[PDB]
Amino acid sequence: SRYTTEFHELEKIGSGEFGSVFKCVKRLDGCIYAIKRSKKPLAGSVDEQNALREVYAHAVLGQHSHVVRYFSAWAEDDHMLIQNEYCNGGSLADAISENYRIMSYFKEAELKDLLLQVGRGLRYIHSMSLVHMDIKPSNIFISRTKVMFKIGDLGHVTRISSPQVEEGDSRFLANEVLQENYTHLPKADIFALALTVVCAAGAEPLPRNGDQWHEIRQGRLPRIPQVLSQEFTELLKVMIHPDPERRPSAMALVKHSVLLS
Ligand SMILES: C=CCn1c(=O)c2cnc(Nc3ccc(N4CCN(C)CC4)cc3)nc2n1-c1cccc([C@H](O)C(F)(F)F)n1
Ligand SMILES: [Cl-]
């Protein structure tokens, strides 16, 4: 197998119904990669779309400081494999779960940094006429040496002007997308990013439905247990505005005065 031949497994770092993700060292260069190994999806099925979106996303994207880098992908033995950059700090979900287990948080300075960096990743992706459509802390990865945030798990990436929408995590999903309005999808990434930062800031777990869910889509920010500048708060506020056209574009976001630096 090319997998065994080119790589040595070190550690299982992720798993799901699809299969697993392994931390591996490539024998030829001695570098660490995150390799996802999954059972070959049914040909034509939704999962085959997912797998295809991920590779054809790189076909357009390539390389960027705030997108998890792809190196290769292949299929063998009824499985598919994708070789990605290894981000040694895990996902923002791990970092948050580790903040809670151990009694920590993210300073306002750090929340802004998170917002700007993922913002730069979105700026790029949108500029390539694509949208990520599954922004959430578990799909934001962290490289340390001192931190770089990188957008990964491109399995939902689709076109701005010809969108095949498999709808993302309900907790981070904008209402217009649920309403089958796909005309401003870049602004759904912006909405999901806002709630991603809210999670990082220490908000209680986001609702999947119910009145709390609807109150958020009405433009009400989840409660943040720490004191943030009103300016920063308002930015997160407008980013989840019910009118997607009122939300800042990724460009406006990365150019925003409150995010200077
Ligand atoms: C290739 C697949 C997607 N992917 C990446 O491109 C990528 C890059 N860098 C890392 N770093 C990384 C993750 C986790 C950990 N852990 C977690 C905490 N644990 C106690 C042990 C250490 C350490 C370093 N990880 C990545 N990916 C990844 C790893 C696990 C799970 C999922 C996705 O949720 C899934 F859907 F693909 F499963 N993705
Ligand atoms: Cl939960």
Task: List, as one string, the DSSP characters of 158-199.
Answer: EESSS-------GGG--HHHHTT--TTTHHHHHHHHHHHHHH
| Number of the ligand closest to the Cα of 204 | 2
Angle among Cα 153, 159, 163 to the nearest 5 degrees reads 105
> What are the E-state strand segments in the chain?
7-15, 19-26, 32-39, 70-76, 79-85, 130-131, 140-144, 147-151, 158-159
What experimental approach yielded this model? X-ray
Which residue's alpha carbon is at the smallest distance from atom 6 of ligand 1? 84
> What is the token pair recorded at 153?
């798990």
Q: Residue type at 118?
A: V
In the chain, residues under CATH classification 1.10.510.10 are 64-68+88-261
In Å, what resolution does this model reach? 2.0
Pocket of ligand 1 (CB under 6 A): 13-14, 16, 21, 34, 36, 68, 82, 84-87, 90-91, 94, 138, 141, 152-153
Indicate which ligand has the atom closest to the C-alpha of 72: 1
- Residue 209 has a CB neighbour count (10 Å cut-off) of 9
Of 82, 67, 50, 58, the closest CA to residue 151 belongs to 67
**147 phi/psi in degrees, rounded to 5:** -120, 140
Helices 108-127 and 186-201 pack at an angle, to 10 degrees, of 160
Please identify, by atom number, the ligand 1 atom nearest to the C-alpha of residue 153: 3
Domain with CATH 3.30.200.20 in the chain: 1-63+69-87
In the block, which residue shows the tokens 């609807």? 214
For residue 79, how many C-alpha atoms fall within 13 Å in the half-sphere facing its CB? 16
Annotated catalytic residues are: 134
Rounded Cα distance between 158 and 206, Å, is: 25
CATH classification (class only), 1-63+69-87: alpha beta
Number of C-beta neighbours around residue 193 at 10 A: 28
The structural architecture, per CATH, of the domain 64-68+88-261 is Orthogonal Bundle (1.10)
Residue 32 CB partners (closer than 8 Å, separation 6+) = 10, 23, 24, 25, 86, 88
What 3-state DSSP class applies to 23?
strand
- Identify the CA nearest to 253 among candidates 189, 205, 204, 207: 189
